[PDB]
């Protein structure tokens, strides 16, 4: 006889009274990338020559990440 | 006999009273990328030569990610 | 006997009282990408030479992602 | 007797065998000017809040600036 | 008797065999000017809040600036 | 008797075999100017809050600046 029975009552929470004056003012920039040959093979994630500006202001940014297994000889 | 019964009553939650004055003002930029040959093979994610501006302001940005398995060889 | 019966009553939720004054003002930009030959094969995602502006302001951006398996000799 | 007789045989000259490969690539920009009240009076030259790009490529840009007076009790 | 007779036989000159490969690539930028009340009066030259890019490539940029007076009380 | 008779045989010159590979690549920047009240009066030259890029490549940049006077009280 085999049993898998985790029991979860968990809480992942936030309370913000007001999320206010966020100012993002990037002053430009210069990016130069040089290469000859690019090979990418199998599951590569690649980012070349970028001038990216991100403002990310979630009213709550909460992550719950879980993984569960019951495995017989994987 | 085999049993799989994870039990979940969990909460991933937010409360924001007001989400307000987000200003995003990128000042331009310059990007120059050089190459000759690109090969990409199998599951590649690729980003070359970019000037991307993102504003992301969700009233709640909460993420729950789960994975469950009951496996006899994989 | 084999049984798979995970039980989920879980909540992924938000409340934002007001979602307000988002200002996005990109100041232009310059992007120059050079290459000669591109090969892309099997499940590739590619983004080459871009000047992209995204405003994303969901009143709730909550994400729940699940995967389940009951697997016999994959 | 009064005699004003200046003599000019002078030369202001150039040769360029060729005037060639000139690249101007401004990467954008952001300008913000704030004020309430403007009182420009008498012979004012003014520029406010500008993002100007000039390419100026004269095959000869030679300047002679000259000025003569014969003046009795100005 | 008064005799004003300056004599000019002078030269202001150039030779360039070629005037070639010139790149101007400004990477953007951010300018913020704040004020309340501006009172420019009498012969003012003014520039406020500028992001200006100039390329100036004359095949000859030779300047002669001259000035003559014969004055009996200014 | 008065005799004003300067004589000028002068030369201001240049020779360049070629005027070649010139790169100007400003990497952006940030300028913030704050003030309340501005009172420019009489012959002012003024610059406030500037992010200016100049490339200046004259095939010859030669200046002659001259001044002649015969004056009975200026």
Curated annotation (Swiss-Prot), chains A, B, C, D, E, F:
**Covalent crosslink: Glycyl lysine isopeptide (Lys-Gly) (interchain with G-Cter in ubiquitin):** 5, 11, 15, 25, 37, 41, 47, 63, 69
Modified positions (N6,N6-dimethyllysine) in chain numbering: 5
Which residues are listed under the site Not glycated? 5, 11, 15, 25, 34, 37, 64, 69
Residues bearing carbohydrate: 41, 47, 63
Q: Which residues carry this modification: N6-acetyllysine?
A: 5, 11, 15, 25, 37, 41, 63
The free-text tissue note of the record is: Expressed in neurons. Isoform PNS-tau is expressed in the peripheral nervous system while the others are expressed in the central nervous system.
Q: Which residues carry this modification: Phosphoserine?
A: 18, 46, 50
Describe its PTM? Phosphorylation at serine and threonine residues in S-P or T-P motifs by proline-directed protein kinases (PDPK1, CDK1, CDK5, GSK3, MAPK) (only 2-3 sites per protein in interphase, seven-fold increase in mitosis, and in the form associated with paired helical filaments (PHF-tau)), and at serine residues in K-X-G-S motifs by MAP/microtubule affinity-regulating kinase (MARK1, MARK2, MARK3 or MARK4), causing detachment from microtubules, and their disassembly. Phosphorylation decreases with age. Polyubiquitinated. Requires functional TRAF6 and may provoke SQSTM1-dependent degradation by the proteasome. PHF-tau can be modified by three different forms of polyubiquitination. 'Lys-48'-linked polyubiquitination is the major form, 'Lys-6'-linked and 'Lys-11'-linked polyubiquitination also occur.
What start and end residues bound the annotated signal peptide?
A: none
Omega-N-methylarginine modification sites are: 43
The segments carrying the Tau/MAP repeats are 1-30, 31-62
Where does it live in the cell? Cytoplasm, Cytosol; Cell membrane; Cytoplasm, Cytoskeleton; Cell projection, Axon
Question: What does the annotation say about its assembly with partners?
Answer: Interacts with MARK1, MARK2, MARK3 and MARK4. Interacts with PSMC2 through SQSTM1. Interacts with SQSTM1 when polyubiquitinated. Interacts with FKBP4. Binds to CSNK1D. Interacts with SGK1. Interacts with PIN1. Interacts with LRRK2. Interacts with LRP1, leading to endocytosis; this interaction is reduced in the presence of LRPAP1/RAP.
Q: Which disease is it linked to?
A: In Alzheimer disease, the neuronal cytoskeleton in the brain is progressively disrupted and replaced by tangles of paired helical filaments (PHF) and straight filaments, mainly composed of hyperphosphorylated forms of TAU (PHF-TAU or AD P-TAU). O-GlcNAcylation is greatly reduced in Alzheimer disease brain cerebral cortex leading to an increase in TAU/MAPT phosphorylations. Frontotemporal dementia 1: A form of dementia characterized by pathologic finding of frontotemporal lobar degeneration, presenile dementia with behavioral changes, deterioration of cognitive capacities and loss of memory. In some cases, parkinsonian symptoms are prominent. Neuropathological changes include frontotemporal atrophy often associated with atrophy of the basal ganglia, substantia nigra, amygdala. In most cases, protein tau deposits are found in glial cells and/or neurons.
Entry text on domains: The tau/MAP repeat binds to tubulin. Type I isoforms contain 3 repeats while type II isoforms contain 4 repeats.
State its role.
Promotes microtubule assembly and stability, and might be involved in the establishment and maintenance of neuronal polarity. The C-terminus binds axonal microtubules while the N-terminus binds neural plasma membrane components, suggesting that tau functions as a linker protein between both. Axonal polarity is predetermined by TAU/MAPT localization (in the neuronal cell) in the domain of the cell body defined by the centrosome. The short isoforms allow plasticity of the cytoskeleton whereas the longer isoforms may preferentially play a role in its stabilization.
Protein known as: Microtubule-associated protein tau
The organism encoding this protein is Homo sapiens (Human)
Please name the gene that encodes this protein.
MAPT
Q: Which residues of the full protein are shown?
A: 624 to 697 of 758
